[PDB]
Design a protein around this nucleic acid. Structure first.
Ligand SMILES: [Mg+2]
Ligand SMILES: [Mg+2]
Ligand SMILES: [Zn+2]
Ligand SMILES: [Zn+2]
Ligand SMILES: [Zn+2]
Ligand SMILES: [Zn+2]
Lengths: 162, 162
DNA sequence: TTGACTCTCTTAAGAGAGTCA
DNA sequence: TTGACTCTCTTAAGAGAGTCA
């Protein structure tokens, strides 16, 4: 098994490589009608991506290192959290983009939480609009808002009460 | 089926059958520290479910009627919305439980909206806690809250800024 | 050891359709 | 005609693993 020192070395090499990804400045809603800025470190759209990186899906990547002749591979956004518990409350921990930018690998834009917590950030009002996430959102979720509901609750007769 | 009259007849038959489902009172968080009461019309746990109804999955059902000597079948919660557009902004419309109770078929607890709008209600603060859904929530979403994030954003070196 | 591809899987909000009696 | 089962699929937030040179 990999030692703590070996895991730390993996995290350090990952950070070195991601730190050379193009850094893109994005203006984003924070909630409360305020605008802020996030700096995303974006993996390239096509190969080559960077040392150790390869694309396994349209917006999925993996990081691979060979240590003492053994090939180790991780989801590309999971590497910052290799020294953390991998489950909580019986749920698997997932890498969760606070910037809602899949290609971004900035570890200051990632957290490690259940898939439900992860998804829910899509609808958060944001750090200046009422976010209650204990690990605070960096921005208003992209799907926050009144929605586009086509038809509301309704009945033709009188069989129901709310 | 094809005619508006035939579709109205389907909705009316569905409402009459669901109106005979057991009415179960559920006390629910509204947001803002307030509580309300919903009356769900719950499909039975096992067969028989009601005229026209059959279970296709653990919490999936379908309603079927014979019209023009042919069988017409629909998702069991889609029947109230058969006269509505089946898409919005190029996204499929889905039956969406405002009561977050799958077995419930009360059309006063259903709306018709994109799967993204549907999902997002799980995290809504609720009608007394800041819901901004244009078709308003009936309760605070069951997943609303601080979350249980295991690890927040972090870096080991000095390669990144937020 | 490494890059660049390939494949399928998980979850929890939702779906369509076939086999029998 | 109606009932009671069976199967796989969709989506968008996420995953694991194989092949070849
Ligand atoms: Mg996310
Ligand atoms: Mg729902
Ligand atoms: Zn980012
Ligand atoms: Zn938040
Ligand atoms: Zn209900
Ligand atoms: Zn709401």
């Amino acid at each position: 098994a990999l030692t703590n020192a070996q895991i730390l070395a993996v995290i350090d090499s990952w950070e070195e490589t991601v730190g050379q990804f193009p850094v893109i400045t994005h203006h984003v809603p924070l909630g409360g009608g305020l605008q802020g800025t996030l700096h995303c470190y974006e993996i390239p759209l096509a190969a080559p991506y960077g040392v150790g990186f390869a694309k396994n899906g349209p917006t999925r990547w993996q990081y691979k290192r060979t240590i003492n002749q053994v090939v180790h591979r991780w989801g590309s956004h999971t590497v910052p959290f290799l020294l953390e518990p991998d489950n909580i409350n019986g749920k698997t921990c997932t890498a969760s983009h606070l910037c809602h930018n899949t290609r971004c690998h900035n570890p200051l834009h990632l957290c490690w939480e259940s898939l439900d917590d992860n998804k829910g950030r899509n609808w958060c009002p944001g750090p200046n609009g009422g976010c209650v996430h204990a690990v605070v959102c960096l921005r208003q979720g992209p799907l926050y808002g009144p929605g586009a509901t086509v038809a509301g609750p309704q009945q033709r007769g009188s069989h129901f009460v709310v």
